[PDB]
Ligand binder design. Structure first.
Ligand SMILES: CCn1cnc2ccccc21
Ligand SMILES: [Zn+2]
Ligand SMILES: [Zn+2]
Length: 582
């Protein structure tokens, strides 16, 4: 308690000595409360005019237009201590899983140099605005690194002064760049050295890319076993227990010297004890603490969510296979059975899963898994939108399974080769491309963001009639040489000025390990669509009068946007499609 967090608390107390007060009408039950101080400030979603002008038919579709308009009573809930059988299963499984992940990897510190390179190419490293303007400025000034140094030596001394969270089914915890560096130094290796790659973790998909996820699910489908299960957890980050945080910390067992001590301090001082500042309109700032739940960097959050989800799902698999009888207590011989299952079949069982943070797909040995719920519920990983003890409903066809907000189609090219393509409801794709975040966007910057969405559609969603047409229109309306941009950056092969057919050939043919015949495609007309009825099922407007008029008159829409941007060099990409080719 207050020995580990007191210093951070004491320090903030004094910067607002003229405003401190223990409020008696504080709304926290599960968060420990400490005091308040005076503040007064808030970032809504803005429309991308280039994309909206080239998607007119969607101006009258509420599922699109409502996306651009406009639970913190889950962060304030509590999770019970698991039983001794559950705690034992998790500790054995975690111990075994860090060793497998560590067999072909070496833990190591990430460097000021690596951190600097990140900030100078815009990665979302959740920092704050004070002393320096942006992240870019702090990194070049040696004053910063002295602040970093002071805290660093403080962590080696087992103490913390400035690693404090700021709060803002989503909840983001911005720290100051200094605390973010120290997190990156100790734990960045998990992401930087791809510990959750499929090659390394067998269940993971880190670095895999949307054009690979469908092929990975089809490979899992080829295993003998039961249905494919894809149960979502209700508020995964809120259900991370202190026992979860202690099994995650065991990665330090594989470290040495300084690194081991630096990593131990991050886990002890910032993860297993937290200090947070929250905006309350009644507007004051609340300084609240708690020991459990996830509140880390988004990138470290991803890897440890993947880790603990892999652990939970292997245990749910053990329960289905009858490896242990009850979570109340493991007998001595159940421990050796669990250990022996892991050594004997653990790697096979990891390969039956696709896990991306809190998101999983499992193809278990048989359907006993569906009603194996005691460990899953007792670990606190309670399923969303089903009653606690109701058996899971599985999927009989890998093409129906949801994963990373998509489903996947099997699409046969006129030449017989097989594409496995990512898909989701087309209203969601159009609605997202019509939104920008933040202020001060020039027309050129807005156009270059439209171009990023268009090239993503040409590479990932070419099989959707409306998106291939809208992508060609946007690429025709934005100057040919203007570089696609994004303010918050899987593998993003569409972020390039290279010809999109050349990039399509590299991603789907040359570099695709599921495509044996490497014959290049010579034109976009060789590249197939979904069936017309399947395209409508997945949200296409093909067949509507609005869509026909848009497609026929597309050059008029392209010319409207070209006239706004002005006298620039443009390319006509519409004749790459059969219907505009004379
Ligand atoms: C886990 C054991 N088991 C297997 N099949 C079931 C069906 C309902 C309840 C429990 C079941
Ligand atoms: Zn600290
Ligand atoms: Zn679809």
């Amino acid at each position: 308690n207050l020995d580990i967090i007191g210093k951070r608390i004491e320090k903030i107390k004094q910067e607002h000595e003229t405003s401190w007060h223990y409020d008696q009408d504080h709304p926290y039950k599960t968060w420990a409360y400490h005091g308040s101080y005076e503040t007064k400030q808030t970032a809504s979603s803005m429309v991308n005019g280039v994309v909206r002008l080239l998607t007119k038919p969607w101006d009258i579709i509420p599922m699109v237009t409502q996306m651009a308009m406009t639970f913190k009573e889950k962060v304030d809930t509590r999770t019970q201590e698991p039983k001794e059988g559950t705690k034992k299963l998790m500790k054995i499984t975690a111990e075994w899983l860090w060793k497998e992940l560590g067999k072909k990897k070496t833990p190591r510190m990430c460097t000021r140099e690596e951190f600097t390179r990140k900030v100078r190419s815009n990665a979302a490293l959740g920092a704050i605005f004070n002393k320096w303007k942006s992240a870019r400025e702090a990194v070049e000034d040696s004053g910063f690194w002295e602040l970093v140094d002071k805290e660093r030596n403080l962590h080696l001394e087992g103490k913390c002064e400035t690693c404090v969270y700021n709060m803002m089914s989503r909840a983001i915890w911005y720290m100051w760049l200094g605390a973010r560096f120290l997190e990156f130094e100790a734990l960045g290796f998990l992401n930087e050295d791809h510990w959750f790659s499929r090659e390394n973790s067998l269940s993971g998909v880190e670095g895999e890319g949307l054009h690979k996820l469908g092929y990975i699910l089809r490979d899992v489908s080829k295993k003998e076993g039961g249905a494919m299960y894809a149960d979502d957890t209700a508020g995964w980050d809120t259900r991370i227990t202190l026992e979860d945080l202690k099994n995650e910390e065991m990665v330090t067992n594989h470290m040495e010297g300084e690194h081991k001590k630096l990593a131990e301090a991050i886990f002890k001082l910032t993860y297993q004890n937290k200090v947070v500042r929250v905006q309350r309109p009644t507007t004051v700032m609340d300084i609240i603490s708690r020991r459990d739940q996830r509140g880390s960097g988004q990138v470290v959050t991803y890897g440890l969510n993947t880790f603990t989800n892999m652990e939970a799902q292997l245990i749910r698999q053990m329960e289905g296979e009858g490896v242990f009888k009850s979570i109340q207590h493991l007998t001595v011989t159940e421990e050796i059975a669990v250990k022996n299952w892991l050594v004997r079949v653990g790697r096979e069982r990891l390969s039956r899963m696709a896990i991306s943070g809190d998101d999983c797909v499992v193809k278990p040995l048989d359907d006993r898994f569906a009603s194996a719920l005691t460990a899953l519920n007792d670990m606190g990983k309670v399923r969303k939108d089903i009653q606690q003890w109701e058996p899971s409903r599985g999927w009989n066809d890998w093409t129906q399974v949801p994963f990373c907000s998509h489903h996947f189609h099997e699409l046969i090219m006129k030449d017989g080769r097989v594409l496995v393509v990512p898909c989701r409801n087309q209203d969601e794709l159009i609605g997202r491309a019509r939104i920008s975040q933040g202020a001060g966007w020039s027309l050129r910057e807005t156009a270059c963001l439209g171009k990023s969405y268009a090239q993503m559609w040409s590479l990932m969603y070419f099989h959707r009639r409306d998106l291939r047409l809208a992508a060609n229109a946007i690429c025709s309306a934005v100057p040919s040489h203007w570089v696609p941009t994004s303010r918050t950056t899987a593998t993003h092969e569409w972020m390039t000025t290279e010809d999109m057919l050349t990039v399509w050939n590299r991603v789907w043919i040359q570099e695709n390990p599921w495509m044996e015949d490497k014959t290049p495609v010579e034109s976009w007309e060789e590249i197939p669509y979904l069936g017309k009825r399947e395209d409508q099922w997945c949200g296409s407007l093909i067949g509507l009068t609005s869509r026909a008029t848009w497609a026929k008159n597309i050059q008029t829409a392209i010319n409207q946007v070209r006239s706004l941007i002005g006298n620039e060099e443009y390319t006509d990409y519409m004749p790459s499609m059969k219907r505009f080719r004379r």
